[PDB]
């Protein structure tokens, strides 16, 4: 079943031209779409109705949309209306041309401390907005921290997001991201998936000694076994880690491949 070259919706009655392929996720596939009138460029998440043949699965996406729809923040992927024909459900989104922070981590391994400061700040600032509006992401990873042409972090993929474990699980994930960014490998990463779940449950990780004491301290508190002892979102920004060392306000695109100078 072919995805139409042009995508029109009943509501806004605008025409979206399906352009270059961008990636995929599970059953969903993403293409760069262009508004044929305004020429504005968007990322079109295309989901086939055949994957949502079961009404239960058709709820998971309508929840995701209802949460993403309500959102407006310079650090969360912009929502720009959704729609459907008989075959596909189309979600029009903000275009992040520099892929995700995962691609960066893969290409870069362990990034520099100022880079982690910049990347974390912007991510935490987005997570704050979410938490303030009573939204928990629940599925935060480097692949969900997208990047645009100005290297701005934009949180996406609200597939497991909920509205009110609680807010403290998102602090946990952020502790993992900070770990991975500074260390260069995920803290509970193993070949075997079952082993990872054991590592998480037993709280088995170890920050190498090569990492900054102040940085390792923050990580540890973020990854604390007692969810009530993990820091709050507001408490993260003000941590010594962000305020003591050098923190750039901008990052070059070169950061996708090599450390900045």
Ligand X SMILES: C[C@H](Nc1cc2c(-c3cc(Cl)cc(CCCO)c3)noc2cn1)c1ccccc1
Indicate the helix (H) or strand (E) that contains 102.
helix 101-108
Residue 24 as a binder of ligand X (CB under 6 A): the answer is: yes
Taking contact as CB under 6 A, which single stretch among the options 93-101, 176-184, 218-226, 233-241 is the one that binds ligand X?
93-101
Say which residues have a Cβ less than 8 Å from residue 20's Cβ, sequence separation at least 6.
31, 32
Identify the active-site residue in 9, 35, 139, 152: 139
Q: Are 111 and 162 in contact (CB under 8 A)?
A: no
CA atoms within 13 A on the CB side of 35: 15
Q: Given candidates 12, 25, 72, 201, which one binds ligand X under the rule CB under 6 A? A: 25
SS3 185: coil
Q: Is 94 annotated as a binding residue?
A: yes
CA 197, 200, 201, 207 torsion-angle sign: positive
- Closest distance of CB 186 from ligand X, Å: 16
6, β-bridge pairs: 17
Residue 143 as a binder of ligand X (CB under 6 A): the answer is: yes
Residue 30 as a binder of ligand X (CB under 6 A): the answer is: yes
- Closest distance of CB 26 from ligand X, Å: 8
Rg of the chain (C-alpha set): 19
Cα 240 to Cα 209: distance, rounded to the nearest angstrom: 19
- End-to-end CA, the chain: 49
Residue 22 as a binder of ligand X (CB under 6 A): the answer is: yes
Which of 131, 229, 142 shows the shortest CA–CA distance to 180? 142
Residue 156 as a binder of ligand X (CB under 6 A): the answer is: yes
Residue 28 as a binder of ligand X (CB under 6 A): the answer is: yes
Residue 43 as a binder of ligand X (CB under 6 A): the answer is: yes
Q: Provide the token pair at 221.
A: 């508190």
153-155 vs 145-147, strand pairing mode: antiparallel
Q: Is 49 annotated as a binding residue?
A: no
Cα 7 to Cα 89: distance, rounded to the nearest angstrom: 11
| Beta carbon nearer to ligand X, 95 or 171 | 95
Which of 56, 183, 48, 17 shows the shortest CA–CA distance to 111? 183
- Closest distance of CB 76 from ligand X, Å: 11
- Closest distance of CB 154 from ligand X, Å: 8
**139 noted as active-site residue:** yes
| Beta carbon nearer to ligand X, 145 or 222 | 145
Taking contact as CB under 6 A, which single stretch among the options 3-11, 92-100, 115-123, 187-195 is the one that binds ligand X?
92-100
Q: Given candidates 96, 174, 183, 251, which one binds ligand X under the rule CB under 6 A? A: 96
- Closest distance of CB 225 from ligand X, Å: 29
Q: Is 103 annotated as a binding residue?
A: no
Residues 62-91 that bind ligand X (CB under 6 A): 77
Report the binding-site residues for ADP: 22, 26, 45, 94, 96
**Which residues are tagged catalytic?**
139
Residues that bind ligand X (CB under 6 A): 22-25, 28-30, 43, 45, 77, 93, 95-97, 99-100, 143, 146, 156-157
């Amino acid at each position: 079943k072919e995805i139409p070259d042009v995508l029109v919706d009943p509501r806004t009655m605008k025409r979206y031209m399906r352009g270059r392929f961008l990636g995929k996720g599970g059953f969903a596939k993403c293409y760069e779409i262009t508004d044929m009138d305004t020429k504005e460029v968007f990322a079109g998440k295309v989901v086939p109705k055949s994957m949502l043949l079961k009404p239960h699965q058709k709820e998971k996406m309508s929840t995701e949309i209802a949460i993403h729809k309500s959102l407006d923040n310079p650090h969360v992927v912009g929502f720009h209306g959704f729609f459907e024909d008989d075959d596909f459900v189309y979600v029009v989104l903000e275009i992040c041309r520099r892929r995700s922070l995962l691609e960066l981590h893969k290409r870069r391994k362990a990034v520099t401390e100022p880079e982690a400061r910049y990347f974390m700040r912007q991510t935490i600032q987005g997570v704050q907005y979410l938490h303030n509006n009573r939204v928990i992401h629940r599925d935060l990873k480097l692949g969900n921290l997208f990047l645009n042409d100005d290297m701005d972090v934009k949180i996406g993929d609200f597939g497991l997001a909920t509205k009110i474990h609680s807010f403290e699980v998102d602090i946990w994930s952020l502790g993992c991201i900070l770990y991975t960014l500074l260390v260069g490998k995920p803290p509970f990463e193993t070949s075997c998936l079952k082993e990872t779940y054991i590592r998480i449950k037993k709280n088995e990780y170890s920050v190498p000694r090569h990492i900054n004491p102040v940085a390792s301290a923050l990580i540890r508190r973020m990854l604390h076994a007692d969810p009530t002892l993990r820091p709050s979102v507001a408490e993260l920004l003000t941590d010594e880690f962000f305020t003591s060392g050098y923190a750039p306000m901008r990052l070059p695109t070169s950061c996708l491949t090599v450390p900045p100078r």
